[PDB]
């Protein structure tokens, strides 16, 4: 068993609904209980829900009881989490994890192994604020030169930044986004390069903001 992938996450208003999916790759979910675990902004892990192999035992954290419903489908090799009546504090990265233990027919296994395959996570943002794509500004180089792109005024997270279509990775630092007073995010991505390359090398930052379907490339030159 090697990977899972969570999807379905995005921006929703409080009171709204979302359906998350977790799909298995390289193994079948069917023998196993599957757990959802979330991580609120800059905080630790909290368990959300679990479902056993035959769907007879579904468990929920008190904070989501009656609002979330977990389910699974063998044909799709997938687990689903239907989230209704969403609350601001449901904002989090949601992870799906396979427990490799055998559970008999409910919370405690005599044949325990644990949560050995987790996904990369899907971000759910619950907010009344509107989607907004970023503006992208160059940070022009003034030995070694530093240059970058300022990715300003977007909502919600996340954006992805690459350089020269992924050809440039060494020396890249993409900073964590910071929420400004306006309630919009901003970050910079920087890279250091040879000063002697500036006349003959092109540097383009590739910015992608999936939530607003914006994709921007920006040339950074002296």
């Amino acid at each position: 068993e090697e990977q899972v992938l969570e999807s379905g996450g995005g921006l929703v208003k409080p009171g709204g609904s979302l359906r998350l999916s977790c799909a298995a790759s390289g193994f079948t979910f069917s023998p196993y209980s599957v757990f959802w675990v979330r991580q609120a902004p800059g905080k630790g892990l909290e368990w959300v829900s679990s479902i056993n192999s035959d769907s007879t035992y579904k468990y929920y954290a008190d904070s989501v009881k009656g609002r979330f419903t977990i389910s699974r489908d063998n044909a799709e090799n997938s687990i689903f989490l239907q989230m209704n009546s969403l609350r601001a504090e449901d904002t989090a990265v949601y992870y799906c994890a396979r427990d490799r233990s055998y559970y008999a027919f409910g919370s405690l296994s005599d044949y325990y192994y644990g949560l050995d395959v987790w996904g990369q996570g899907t971000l759910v943002t619950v907010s009344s604020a509107s989607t907004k794509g970023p503006s992208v500004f160059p940070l022009a180089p003034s030995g070694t030169a530093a240059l970058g792109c300022l990715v300003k005024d977007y909502f919600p997270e996340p954006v992805t930044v690459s350089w020269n279509s992924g050809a440039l990775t060494s020396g890249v630092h993409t900073f964590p986004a910071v929420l400004q007073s306006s309630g919009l995010y901003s970050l910079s991505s920087v890279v250091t390069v040879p000063s002697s390359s500036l006349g003959t090398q092109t540097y383009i930052c590739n910015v992608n903001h999936k939530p607003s379907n914006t994709k921007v490339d920006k040339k950074v030159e002296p």
Partner: protein, 217 residues
Amino acid sequence: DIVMTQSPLSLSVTPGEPASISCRSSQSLLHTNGYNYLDWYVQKPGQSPQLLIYLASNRASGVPDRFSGSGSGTDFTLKISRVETEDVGVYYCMQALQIPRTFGQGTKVEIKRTVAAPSVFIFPPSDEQLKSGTASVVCLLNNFYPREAKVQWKVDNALQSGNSQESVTEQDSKDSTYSLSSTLTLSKADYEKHKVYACEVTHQGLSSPVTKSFNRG
């Protein structure tokens, strides 16, 4: 429910040295079958969380042998015998005795290295940004250790307050350094009124603060 507590909440360890993290539960995790239902997980920057230890003392397959776990009842320990630079991350214990599953707060592991002063760069706002009506001035501190740093903005030698924000990278898994951005935000109107912009950096690795500056606006 069962509450899990970890100690310490942060560690700083030199590569090659051992590290220990303690986990305490609010009730015993020892089941009548003889096993203790305590797992350890690690979450590294931008990666899937990884199972390290299950049933208190068993190393999961694929986990390096530097990791071990011990303890029983309400007191457990994760030990790393010889830390490596890639061990940066946040380590969590989790009990698996009862629903709800519950996790400790997380313990952040930092790699200690020799002091490294930042390389400092300053960036004026682009002509392009000035059309938006706002001006951002960016000061970059690159590849330094330790994380603690003071960045002071001056505009025509007047100290700035309340109009800057900082962002710091996670510690690099190979060189054990940090990088930091400080962004000074002002109206285009205010930017164009003043001439000299400077960021002064103070850091353990700098015998005296370094200032980077530019003229325009």
